[PDB]
Amino acid sequence: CQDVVQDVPNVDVQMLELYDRMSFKDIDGGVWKQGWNIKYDPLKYNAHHKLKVFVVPHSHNDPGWIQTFEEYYQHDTKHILSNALRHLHDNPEMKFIWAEISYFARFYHDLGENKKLQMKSIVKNGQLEFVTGGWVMPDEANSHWRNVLLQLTEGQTWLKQFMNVTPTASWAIDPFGHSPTMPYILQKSGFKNMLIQRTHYSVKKELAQQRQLEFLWRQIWDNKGDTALFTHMMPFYSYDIPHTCGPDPKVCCQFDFKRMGSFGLSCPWKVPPRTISDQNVAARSDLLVDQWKKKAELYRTNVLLIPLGDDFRFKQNTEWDVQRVNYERLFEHINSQAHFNVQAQFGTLQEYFDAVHQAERAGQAEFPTLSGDFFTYADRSDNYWSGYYTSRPYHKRMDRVLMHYVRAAEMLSAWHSWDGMARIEERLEQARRELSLFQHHDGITGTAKTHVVVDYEQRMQEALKACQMVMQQSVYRLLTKPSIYSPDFSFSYFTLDDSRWPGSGVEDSRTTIILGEDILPSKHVVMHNTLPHWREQLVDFYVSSPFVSVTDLANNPVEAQVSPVWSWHHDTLTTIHPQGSTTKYRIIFKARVPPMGLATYVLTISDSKPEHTSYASNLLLRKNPTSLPLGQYPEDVKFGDPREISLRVGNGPTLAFSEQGLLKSIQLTQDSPHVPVHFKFLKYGVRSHGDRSGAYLFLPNGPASPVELGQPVVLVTKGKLESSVSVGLPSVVHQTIMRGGAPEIRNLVDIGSLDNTEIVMRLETHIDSGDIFYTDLNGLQFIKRRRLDKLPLQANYYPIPSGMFIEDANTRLTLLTGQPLGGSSLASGELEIMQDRRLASDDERGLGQGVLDNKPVLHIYRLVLEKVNNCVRPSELHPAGYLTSAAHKASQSLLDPLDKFIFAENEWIGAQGQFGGDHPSAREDLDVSVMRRLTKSSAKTQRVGYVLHRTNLMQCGTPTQKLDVCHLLPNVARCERTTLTFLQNLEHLDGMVAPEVCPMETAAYVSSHS
Ligand SMILES: [Zn+2]
C-alpha cells in the first residue's frame, strides 16, 4: 500500500497552488469576452498534417427542473428519442450521444417489439452512443459518493441487460462545478476518459494559455498515479452551439440552423443563420474553418471536438433535417478543398477520445498531470454559485436519511433468497431509482420549480416506506425460530422508530408504546447495526408511563434513564417557550449490537420507580415563571433566572453555556484548560441595487450581522446517561446534547416569512488557523482550502457535504454534518455553516422564481475538540487532510445510526435474542458501504455483491478480526474482484478470499454460492 501521509505527489497543476498565484482579473478579451484574440500559424496544417474535426450532436435532457420528470417525458423527451431512432436508421452517417438512462429506460419499455430491434441495431453499429450511462448526470457538490455510485450502477446495469454496452467515456456538461470524486469512481468502474464544462471563467483562461485543458486527473494523495483519468475541459462560457464552434459566438450562432425559418428562435448577436447553397458555401466555410482553427490552438493534438446541441434539442423531424443537410453541405465543400487541409464529419465522444490517444501514441503530444477540485464556480464577474450548497435544505437532509434506509434495506434482505410473492426486488428497485433520480443537478441542489420539488419529495417518501417494509419483514425472518416462522408478506410485524427524521418538532408522528400491568405489561424492541464492527449506543423510545425497566431477552437488567417529552411554541402575547407532555415519556438505554447484526430488548411496566431506571432533573431558566406540570413524571421542574451553566456526562468533556443557552467553553479532562468555543447565530441579506441572490447565486450585502436574541427561554435537562441545553431563538430551537463524548448539536430551523435572509451558525475559537481550513468532497476525502481576501466573501464558501475542520500546532475543532450545507472559515479560529435561505428574487439562470417555499427542518451535527500535537500530520505542502478515529466515528453516528424496530402485536412466539454474534468485527477504518443480493430466487447460482471502503485516519499513538466478505454467506463456490458497478470480473481470487484494501481505496467483490 502507498503511504498517503508522508509523500506529496509531484503534479504539473495543483489547484490550491494555482489559486494562490492567479490574479482572477475580469478583463474584456474581445469577441471571446473572458479570454483573448486567438491567433494561429496558417502553415501549421498542410497535405501531411491535417486538422481532423468531429461534430458530435447531443441533447441536454434534465430529469426535472422547470417541469417534472413525467411532464418532460410526455412533452419533450419521448419525441427526441422517437425522432433519433427514425433519423439515425434512415441516415447511417448521422451520429448522436445520450447521457440520461432514467429517460432512455422509460422510452425503451414503451416501444413495440419491432422498434426495440431497430433501436438495438443503431446502438450495436455505433450511431447512437451512450455517454457515462448513469440514471442521471449528478450534482458533484452536495452528493454523497455512495449515491453517485448507486445512480451510475442503476443506469449501467440497465444498459448491460438491455443494450449489451458499458460506456467508458463520461459527459458532464451542466453540474455547477466539478469534484475529483467523479474520476475516482469512474476509474474504478472501467472508464478511460471524461469531459467537464462548468469551471470558473478565470481557470478556463489560465489553463487555455498553457494548453492544459486536457490533463491526467489524479487524487490529491496519489503519489504513484494509478487513480489518473484522462479529462477534457471545454474552454468557453456555455455548451450551447454559439459557444462550441470557436471563440466568437456572433459567428457560431449563424451555424445553429434551428435559429432561422419557422421555429421562432433567433441570434442575440443579431446576425441570423443562412441556408448553405452553392452561392455562399465558400464564404460560409471560410468563417467556420477559421473558428475551428482558433479553437484548435487551445489543445495539443490535430483532433478537434465540436459539440452540436442545447437543452431538449432534436425534438422535431424538421430540426434533424435542417441541422444534418446544412452541415453535410459544409463537410462536402471543406473536405473537397485542399487549401483548408481539414477532414470534418459527424462523430461520437468515444471516436474523439480514441483519435486523441492515437495522436498521443504517435508522439504528437504529452499531457500534463493535475490534482485538486473545481469549486467554487463563477460564470461571470462576482456571480459565484455557492447558494445551491444550501437551497431547499429540508430535501438535502432527506437525501441522507434515504441513503441510510436504502443501505439498511439492501443489507437486511441480502442474508436470504425471497419468494417472488414477497415483492422484495420490486420495492428495492423503486427505492434505488427514486434516490438515484434525486442526485440530478436540479434535485439535491435545490434549483427546481416548487411543484418539481414536491414531486421529488413524494417520490422519496414512497422510497422510505418501501425500505421500511423490506427492513421489518427481514428482521422478523432473522429473529424468529424456524419452527414458528410462517410469514404473511403483506403484514407489519414491526414499525420503525426514527428520532431524527423528520424530527418530533417537524412532524409529531413517533409511536408511543402503551404498557399497563393488566392489558399489556411488556414490549419487544430490536436494534440493527449496518456497520461491520460491534457498536454500543444510546437509543430512545416513547412510552405511556415513566415506570419502565429494560432487560435483554435473557432477562439481564439494563441501566436506563427516563426524560420528559418537550415541544416549543410561540406565545402570541409575549416569547418562544417549552411545554411538557403529561401523557408520554422517553426511555433511554445503551444497546450493544453485533457487526452487521441485530439485538432484542424488552421494556416492562411497574407500579413505581424501578431499581435500574433513573429520572432526569429539569431546570427552566426564565424570569417570571408559570407552572409546568408533567403528569406521572416523578421529579418537579425547577425554576431560576437566566445564568451561566456547566454540564458533564460520565468522565467525558465538561461544557459551559452563556445565559442565552449557547456554548462558551469545552474542558476535555479534569486537569486540562477551559478552551473557549462560542456558538453564535448571524444573518446575511440581499443587495438593493445590482445582482440579487437566488437558488444558485450567493450575493451578500456585506458581512453577516448579529441576530437580536432578546432574553430567550433556556431548558436544562440533566441525567446520568443523557443531558441537554435547549434554547428558543428567533427562527431556531438550538440544542446541545451530551452522552459522554463529543456533543450532538440539533437546530430546528423555521425561517418563516423572513424574506431576503440567510441564517448562518458560526463557531469562534482561539485556534490559530490563519487562512487555512478543511472541507470534504462527497463524504469521501478532506481537501485543504485557503481563504483568499482578493476574492469576494461568496467565493470563500465551499460545499460541506459531511464535515469541516480548523487546526494549529496543538488543537483541532471538527464539525460533522447529517446534511450537505454551504460553509467557510472567514477569519482565524472560525467555522461557519448556513442553515436556510429565503430569497424573493430570481437570479437570471432560467429557474424563473425565487426561493419562498421554505419549511421547518431538523439539522444535526457532532462537535469534536481534540489535541493534535501527538498526531503524525501530513507535511505543510500536502493538499489533503485526514480525520481522527473520534471524528470518523462521530460522522458514522450521524450518517448510519442504529435502526430501531417496535414489535407491532401483543405476543412474539419464537422471539430470538441476537443475529450476527459470529460476524467478524473489522478494523475501525473499514466499512461495508454496500451489501446487495444480485440474483432472484430462480437463479441456480446465487450471487452477492459487496463494496468495501477503507478511509485513512491520523495516527495519534493510542493503537480486531480480518473481514473476508466472500465467506459471510455459506457454500461459497467462487469469489471475484469486480468493477464498483459489479458488471465486469477483474480477478478470480486465490482461496475464495476477498483481501484487505489499502488506505483511501474502494474495491468491489462478488461471491457465488451453490
Ligand atoms: Zn441540466
Swiss-Prot record:
Query: Which residues of this UniProt protein bind Zn(2+)?
Result: H60, D62, D174, H441
Q: Does the keyword DNA repair apply?
A: no
What keywords sit in the KW lines? Disulfide bond, Glycosidase, Golgi apparatus, Hydrolase, Membrane, Metal-binding, Signal-anchor, Transmembrane, Transmembrane helix, Zinc
> What's its EC?
3.2.1.114
Which parts of the chain does the record assign to the membrane side Lumenal? 1-1010
According to its UniProt record, which cofactors does this protein need? Zn(2+)
Q: What SUPFAM superfamilies does UniProt report for this protein, alphabetically?
A: Families 57/38 glycoside transferase middle domain, Galactose mutarotase-like, Glycoside hydrolase/deacetylase
> Which GO molecular-function terms appear in the entry?
alpha-mannosidase activity; carbohydrate binding; mannosidase activity; mannosyl-oligosaccharide 1,3-1,6-alpha-mannosidase activity; metal ion binding
Which Gene Ontology BP annotations are present? encapsulation of foreign target; mannose metabolic process; N-glycan processing; protein glycosylation; rhodopsin biosynthetic process
Q: Which reaction does it catalyse?
A: N(4)-{beta-D-GlcNAc-(1->2)-alpha-D-Man-(1->3)-[alpha-D-Man-(1->3)-[alpha-D-Man-(1->6)]-alpha-D-Man-(1->6)]-beta-D-Man-(1->4)-beta-D-GlcNAc-(1->4)-beta-D-GlcNAc}-L-asparaginyl-[protein] + 2 H2O = 2 alpha-D-mannopyranose + an N(4)-{beta-D-GlcNAc-(1->2)-alpha-D-Man-(1->3)-[alpha-D-Man-(1->6)]-beta-D-Man-(1->4)-beta-D-GlcNAc-(1->4)-beta-D-GlcNAc}-L-asparaginyl-[protein]
Stimuli inducing this protein:
Inhibited by swainsonine and by copper sulfate.
Compartments where located: Golgi apparatus membrane
Q: Which GO terms describe its cellular component?
A: endoplasmic reticulum; Golgi membrane; Golgi stack
Quaternary structure note: Homodimer; disulfide-linked.
Protein name listed in UniProt: Alpha-mannosidase 2
* Gene field: alpha-Man-IIa
